Amino acid sequence: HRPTTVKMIDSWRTEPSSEKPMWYNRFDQVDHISQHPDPEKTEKYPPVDDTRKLMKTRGDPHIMRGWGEYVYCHYEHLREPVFPRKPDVAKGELAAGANVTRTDVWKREGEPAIQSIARFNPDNFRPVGYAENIPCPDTCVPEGHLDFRHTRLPTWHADRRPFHYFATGMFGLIGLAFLRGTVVKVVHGLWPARDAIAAGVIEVDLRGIQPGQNFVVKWRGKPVFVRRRTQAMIDAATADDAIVNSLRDPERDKDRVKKPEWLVMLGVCTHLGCVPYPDQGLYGGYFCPCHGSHYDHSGRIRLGPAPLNMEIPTYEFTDDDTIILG
Amino acid sequence: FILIIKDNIILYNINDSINYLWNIGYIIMVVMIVQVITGIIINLYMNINNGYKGIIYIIKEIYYGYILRYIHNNNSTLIYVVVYLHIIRNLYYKTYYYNILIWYSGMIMLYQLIIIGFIGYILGWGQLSYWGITVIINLISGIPYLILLISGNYYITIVTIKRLYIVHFILPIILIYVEIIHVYYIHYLINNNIVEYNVNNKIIFNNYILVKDNNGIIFILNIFILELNNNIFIIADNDNLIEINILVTPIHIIPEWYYLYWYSILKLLPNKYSGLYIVVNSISIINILSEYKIVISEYKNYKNIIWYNQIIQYISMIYIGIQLPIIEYINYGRYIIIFNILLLIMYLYPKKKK
Amino acid sequence: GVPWRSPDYITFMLMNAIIGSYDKKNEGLVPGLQSANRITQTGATRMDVGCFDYYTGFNIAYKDT
Amino acid sequence: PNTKRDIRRLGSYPVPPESKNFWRGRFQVPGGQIQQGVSPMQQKIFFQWWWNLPTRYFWRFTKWSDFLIPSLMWYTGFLMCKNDVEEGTRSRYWY
Amino acid sequence: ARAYCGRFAFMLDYPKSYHPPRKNEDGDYVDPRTDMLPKCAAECSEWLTEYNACVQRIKMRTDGRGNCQGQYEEFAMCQDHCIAHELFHYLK
Amino acid sequence: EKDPPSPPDWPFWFKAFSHCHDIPSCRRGYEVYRQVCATCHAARFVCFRHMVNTIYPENRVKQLAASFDYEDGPNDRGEMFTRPGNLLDPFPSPYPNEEAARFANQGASPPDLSQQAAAHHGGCDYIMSLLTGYRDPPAGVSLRSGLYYNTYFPGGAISMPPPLNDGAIEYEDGTPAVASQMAKDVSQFLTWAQDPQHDERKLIGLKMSTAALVWLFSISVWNRHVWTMIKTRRIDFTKTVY
Numbered sequence A: 001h002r003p004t005t006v007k008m009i010d011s012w013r014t015e016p017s018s019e020k021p022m023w024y025n026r027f028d029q030v031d032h033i034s035q036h037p038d039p040e041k042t043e044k045y046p047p048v049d050d051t052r053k054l055m056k057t058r059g060d061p062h063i064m065r066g067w068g069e070y071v072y073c074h075y076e077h078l079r080e081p082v083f084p085r086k087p088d089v090a091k092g093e094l095a096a097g098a099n100v101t102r103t104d105v106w107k108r109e110g111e112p113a114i115q116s117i118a119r120f121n122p123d124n125f126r127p128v129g130y131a132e133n134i135p136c137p138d139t140c141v142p143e144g145h146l147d148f149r150h151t152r153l154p155t156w157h158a159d160r161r162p163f164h165y166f167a168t169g170m171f172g173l174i175g176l177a178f179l180r181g182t183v184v185k186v187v188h189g190l191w192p193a194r195d196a197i198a199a200g201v202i203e204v205d206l207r208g209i210q211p212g213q214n215f216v217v218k219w220r221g222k223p224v225f226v227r228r229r230t231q232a233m234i235d236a237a238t239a240d241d242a243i244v245n246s247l248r249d250p251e252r253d254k255d256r257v258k259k260p261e262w263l264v265m266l267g268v269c270t271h272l273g274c275v276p277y278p279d280q281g282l283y284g285g286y287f288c289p290c291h292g293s294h295y296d297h298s299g300r301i302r303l304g305p306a307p308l309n310m311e312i313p314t315y316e317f318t319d320d321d322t323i324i325l326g
Numbered sequence B: 001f002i003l004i005i006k007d008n009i010i011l012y013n014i015n016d017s018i019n020y021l022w023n024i025g026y027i028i029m030v031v032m033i034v035q036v037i038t039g040i041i042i043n044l045y046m047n048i049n050n051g052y053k054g055i056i057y058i059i060k061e062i063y064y065g066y067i068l069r070y071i072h073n074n075n076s077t078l079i080y081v082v083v084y085l086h087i088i089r090n091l092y093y094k095t096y097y098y099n100i101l102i103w104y105s106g107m108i109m110l111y112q113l114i115i116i117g118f119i120g121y122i123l124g125w126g127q128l129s130y131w132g133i134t135v136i137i138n139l140i141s142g143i144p145y146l147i148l149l150i151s152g153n154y155y156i157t158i159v160t161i162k163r164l165y166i167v168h169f170i171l172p173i174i175l176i177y178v179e180i181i182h183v184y185y186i187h188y189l190i191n192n193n194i195v196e197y198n199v200n201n202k203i204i205f206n207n208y209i210l211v212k213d214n215n216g217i218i219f220i221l222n223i224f225i226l227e228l229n230n231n232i233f234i235i236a237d238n239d240n241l242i243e244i245n246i247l248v249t250p251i252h253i254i255p256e257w258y259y260l261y262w263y264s265i266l267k268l269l270p271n272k273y274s275g276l277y278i279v280v281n282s283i284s285i286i287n288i289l290s291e292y293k294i295v296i297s298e299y300k301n302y303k304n305i306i307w308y309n310q311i312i313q314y315i316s317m318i319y320i321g322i323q324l325p326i327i328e329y330i331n332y333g334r335y336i337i338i339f340n341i342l343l344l345i346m347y348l349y350p351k352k353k354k
Numbered sequence C: 001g002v003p004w005r006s007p008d009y010i011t012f013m014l015m016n017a018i019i020g021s022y023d024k025k026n027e028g029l030v031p032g033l034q035s036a037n038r039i040t041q042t043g044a045t046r047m048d049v050g051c052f053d054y055y056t057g058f059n060i061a062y063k064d065t
Numbered sequence D: 001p002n003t004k005r006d007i008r009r010l011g012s013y014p015v016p017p018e019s020k021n022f023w024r025g026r027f028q029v030p031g032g033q034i035q036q037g038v039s040p041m042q043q044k045i046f047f048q049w050w051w052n053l054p055t056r057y058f059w060r061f062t063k064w065s066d067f068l069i070p071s072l073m074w075y076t077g078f079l080m081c082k083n084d085v086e087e088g089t090r091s092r093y094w095y
Numbered sequence E: 001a002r003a004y005c006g007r008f009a010f011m012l013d014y015p016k017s018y019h020p021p022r023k024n025e026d027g028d029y030v031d032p033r034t035d036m037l038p039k040c041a042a043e044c045s046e047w048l049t050e051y052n053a054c055v056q057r058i059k060m061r062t063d064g065r066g067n068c069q070g071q072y073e074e075f076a077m078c079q080d081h082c083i084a085h086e087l088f089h090y091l092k
Numbered sequence F: 001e002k003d004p005p006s007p008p009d010w011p012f013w014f015k016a017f018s019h020c021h022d023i024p025s026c027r028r029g030y031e032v033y034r035q036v037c038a039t040c041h042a043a044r045f046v047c048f049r050h051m052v053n054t055i056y057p058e059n060r061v062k063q064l065a066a067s068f069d070y071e072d073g074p075n076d077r078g079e080m081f082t083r084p085g086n087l088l089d090p091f092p093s094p095y096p097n098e099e100a101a102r103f104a105n106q107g108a109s110p111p112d113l114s115q116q117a118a119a120h121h122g123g124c125d126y127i128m129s130l131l132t133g134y135r136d137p138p139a140g141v142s143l144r145s146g147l148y149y150n151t152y153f154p155g156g157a158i159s160m161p162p163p164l165n166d167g168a169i170e171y172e173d174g175t176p177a178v179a180s181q182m183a184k185d186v187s188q189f190l191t192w193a194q195d196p197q198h199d200e201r202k203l204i205g206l207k208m209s210t211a212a213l214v215w216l217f218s219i220s221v222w223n224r225h226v227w228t229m230i231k232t233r234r235i236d237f238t239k240t241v242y
């Protein structure tokens, strides 16, 4: 048995059952269990038609006293005394357990002792009126209650399988839609946020720029130089377009500009990240003052410590007077 | 684990006579998983730096972030509704008389839940949460130096949030482990029935009880979806959307609705510690309500008059908590506390024999 | 099942034969653990004891059922 | 599990590992029983809800009426407190 | 946490039509609320009598103590509940 | 004493389950906020991009933002400059810190109106009631200069001057500009500002709630089916009926 406990204790306030039985202590005793009346073959109390005619009940509503929640029960766990109170079996009181062994209520004057104690087997005592009161059910579904006989469909009914599986399937249809929506929306939250998307892609208005002017746009944390190039600037890079392969990083101006008039580059020196200043250097391009790197009018490194050309960002032309960075 | 699952879900036999009040536990388990998942996902877009702006950034910038924010707040309310209703049920059918081990495992989860919730509302960096942790931390102000250790400073600050957040992240996973210990005892110590005795009327779980348990959970979902998207019931105080000012005291420093029964206890009793102590009594005495009995009976399926007056005592105390600290509410509330003790004594006392 | 005169009756006879019969107390030349009958073989393995003390298929036919 | 007499098994075949809980809830049926039933595919599945509807709600409301007197005492107290609060506020303040 | 509690539209008595605000002799539109003030004050006459009584009781006191804010807040709450039921019908 | 008087229950359009935020009213509300409330309050957490394609067209929002001057920087020389506003800027704030604001309102701090539509009991109703709740002081109550009586403010005395006066602004759409209209409109706008995703939440909620009802009916038919097996069985002991 599992870890268990019974309140088999000597109470300080409540008496044992042997002293104060809580049941209606009237029993019928027989010599052998077979002599008890048979409940199934015994006539019961006559049926009634009104609940106010139902017989009275032998229980005592006030069997227990004191503070506490109301309860009616016949039994307790309390321990019995070494010398229990002798039961009055002549008047019908029950003799079972401690009040038979540790008492002499079983002794008859002249009967053999073995026969006397045999009559006090717990099976030889039954409550008075047992066979006339105990319900002996023949079914769990009493007459007048619904069962399969009444709920069975007529034999001409149509198959009920096709619709049942539609219902179980619709629970699956709707469930899977809710699951898809839940999963798809959770992953969607990982997409760059609304504020992040807005800053990411930047449309730059080229209207108002003058030829030769360089402006800076902070795009994704980096300076993005956008310079309109005068014909002199464009021709200058075109001239170096022939001397390609004589440059540290050979690149042609056509492959660094989408439109010759417009140079969009990231303004970060390829040496150690300093931001170059325009219209400076030996090529009138962009001179990084940190360590002395000179870039041309196409952004290609021509002198200094820098190793590569200034990078060309991802950008397209929406129209003739607008670019979109990203 | 597949065989374990089959033994505890597919070939698990339960009595066929149980009501829909035996489905509450299934709902707790499901809504609990939802609260962990949504919590982990919210944390993907917010941390402890500034919750006030973080909650704003979740509801305005994250795609479908509003769903995550409101589910996590409303599903907490739901967790505490279902749990508190699960206890009311267990009291009505006195499911602690022979299944105390199940009751003990549940109470452990209740204790953990009461700490998980309190600390989640400080993660929002709101006025009513700032000043409600400042008022509950000062109840252990007697234990020397303990406030400083917990707070990490002389006033509540980001330092206090950075640490409580870890308790809020981790404690729920432990709760899920105690849920296994709870389902372990339930499966060994068979569940109680609507009838006091034990009857051979058991049916497998997956084919019957799970279909019924899902009808229940889907019923609650319909109602929870309406609250989640239309706020049919005010379950969150509005004063948590006011930026924390440490100089101005809120109009009313009250907890969320599911701590108003222990907030009132603390505002009714005249000594601070007496209040703390009566809040211990409430969560502890209910664990020994069958220990002193001596009769062979579980006191079950009577009129349960004592039970009804207890459930109403809880509701009435929650009302007094909403109300301001007016004297007349304090006097009446002290009588309600005296009445609870007498009702509790009635449960505890064994009966003498006429 | 099917009636006597059904075109499928012989198919049901064969299906009855496939199910076959098995008795732990008369296993035959081939043991259950190594039987060609799939029902018998899988059954003989359950719990290392066997889950069929006896079983047989049946195919009962009447004029209309 | 059930009583040790109830879970005592007549058969000598070992308990399958996946059916441990199932066989710890075994009952020793005394005298026998004749259980019958019909598949739900050949029955009316919603009628019984309607057939039992009146009696279900009658026997529910008759039991819940036990709490009427308790409910009325508690509401009387709720009204007394409300009025006491109002009169007390109007007395402390309200010239 | 949220601004409003949701309700069925049949529980939300939204104005079914719009009556434009009256125009003054000068030609400036008169506030619908100001026009509704006297009518709603009459609907709250019982609280207004309580407030008016307080005013006269505090007027007698020969000390400078005495306020009638408590009774004014009850009258104002009543007058405003009346306004809420019919004001948005004059507002676009 | 008692808590501040509860705001009346105003019949805003968006209060019904299947109703949206009335964009025409929200647009007028922006005008009221920009021309009246903005002088003292700030909406730090409301950005111009939030209004694009929701309250106003993109070009219009650019013009509104460009009307303001913001402090950006630093430049290459480490200095701070002033630029016109953009769609990524928050709504302008009248005062640089809370101490500057307090010094301009008799010590009182104009609260940020970003979440005020849901920061007070009553919600949107509290804004409408407050703005239309100024009254002559109750008898026996005397208010100093700069203190005004309002039935819905906690205590009764608010340091905010009555902000809405008839004819204060002219609505672009021609709606008559009266105090109660401006109130209804600025309350609508501030409610939108608090939760700009209110309409998405309610349209997706409508599709979820209705679907959940169909789902309930499927699981109910299923429950009724499988439990018929159990609830119609007949166990007999000394009886037999077929």
Ligand SMILES: CCCCCCCCCCCCCCCCCC(=O)OC[C@H](COP(=O)([O-])OCC(O)COP(=O)([O-])OC[C@@H](COC(=O)CCCCCCCCCCCCCCCCC)OC(=O)CCCCCCCCCCCCCCCCC)OC(=O)CCCCCCCCCCCCCCCCC
Pocket (backbone or CB within 6 Å): A007, A009, A010, A011, A012, A013, A014, B278, B281, B291, B292, B293, B294, B337, B338, B339, B341, B342, B345, B348, B349, B350
């Ligand atoms: C607003 C209203 C506020 C009201 C406040 C006060 C309300 C008090 C209500 C309860 C008391 C009512 C009056 C009691 C009179 C005396 C009774 C007596 O002697 O009983 C013997 C008697 C034994 O008779 P029995 O029938 O044989 O018992 C069979 C049982 O099955 C036993 O089964 P078992 O055989 O397994 O035995 C288990 C064992 C279990 O016992 C234990 O666990 C023992 C250890 C714990 C209890 C004893 C020590 C407690 C600590 C004392 C202080 C230590 C200071 C140390 C300082 C050190 C400094 C260096 O217990 C016993 O054997 C019996 C004793 C039962 C425990 C209680 C004993 C003390 C009674 C007084 C309680 C406190 C009253 C405070 C009043 C304040 C002013 C108003 O017990 C009973 O009558 C039954 C139990 C009745 C009491 C149940 C108590 C439940 C637990 C909570 C108690 C407090 C509740 C209220 C708290 C409110 C605020 C938090």
Ligand code: HEC
Pocket (backbone or CB within 6 Å): F032, F033, F036, F037, F038, F039, F040, F041, F105, F108, F109, F110, F111, F113, F116, F127, F131, F153, F154, F158, F159, F160, F161, F163, F164, F186
């Ligand atoms: C434009 C119509 C508005 C709106 C919608 C609001 N105000 Fe004001 N306000 C001002 C000051 C100094 C305060 C604080 C005063 C203090 O409470 O003592 C406020 C307060 C508010 C609130 C909050 C009320 C609360 O209970 O805290 C709200 C919602 C509000 N205001 C809205 C000052 C001014 C002005 C200075 C002259 C102007 C102009 C406005 N407010 C305008 C508006």
Ligand code: HEM
Pocket (backbone or CB within 6 Å): B021, B022, B023, B024, B025, B026, B028, B029, B083, B086, B087, B090, B095, B096, B099, B102, B103, B104, B105, B106, B107, B108, B109, B110, B113, B179, B182, B186, B190, B191, B192, B193
């Ligand atoms: C995190 C919260 C908890 C969850 C996940 C939970 C889960 C469950 C589950 C699934 C059941 C079995 C199904 C049922 O009959 O409804 C159950 C039973 C039970 N729970 Fe909990 N429970 C929790 C809280 C509690 C608490 C706080 C208590 C104690 C006050 C408690 C006490 C019980 C008892 C006594 C039972 C057995 C009921 C009966 O006898 O059948 N539970 N619980």
Ligand code: HEM
Pocket (backbone or CB within 6 Å): B035, B036, B037, B038, B039, B040, B042, B043, B046, B055, B069, B072, B073, B076, B079, B113, B116, B117, B118, B119, B120, B121, B122, B123, B124, B168, B169, B170, B172, B173, B175, B236
């Ligand atoms: C027993 C389970 C849990 C409950 C009862 C609980 C409770 C809540 C509560 C009441 C809130 C306040 C919501 C609001 O601000 O109004 C909160 C906030 C939060 N919770 Fe939980 N939570 C649970 C578990 C978790 C888990 C496992 C995580 C993930 C690590 C998590 C992450 C968060 C976060 C990040 C917040 C702050 C964001 C917010 O305010 O919504 N929670 N929690």
Ligand SMILES: COC1=C(OC)C(=O)C(CC=C(C)C)=C(C)C1=O
Pocket (backbone or CB within 6 Å): B114, B117, B118, B119, B128, B129, B131, B132, B133, B135, B136, B139, B253, B254, B255, B256, B259, B262, B263, B266, B276, B279
């Ligand atoms: C603000 O948050 C909270 C309170 O504020 C007053 C509480 O009273 C309580 C109750 C505290 C105790 C000590 C019972 C909790 C749990 C709470 O979350």
Ligand SMILES: COC1=C(OC)C(=O)C(CC=C(C)C)=C(C)C1=O
Pocket (backbone or CB within 6 Å): B081, B084, B085, B087, B088, B258, B259, B261, B262, B282, B283, B314, B315, B318
């Ligand atoms: C002691 O723990 C508590 C309960 O469980 C018994 C409650 O029922 C309640 C009351 C719950 C409701 C739904 C009114 C609360 C708040 C509580 O604190």
Ligand code: FES
Pocket (backbone or CB within 6 Å): A269, A270, A271, A272, A273, A274, A288, A289, A290, A291, A292, A293, A304, A305, A306
């Ligand atoms: S960083 Fe540009 S020269 Fe080195």
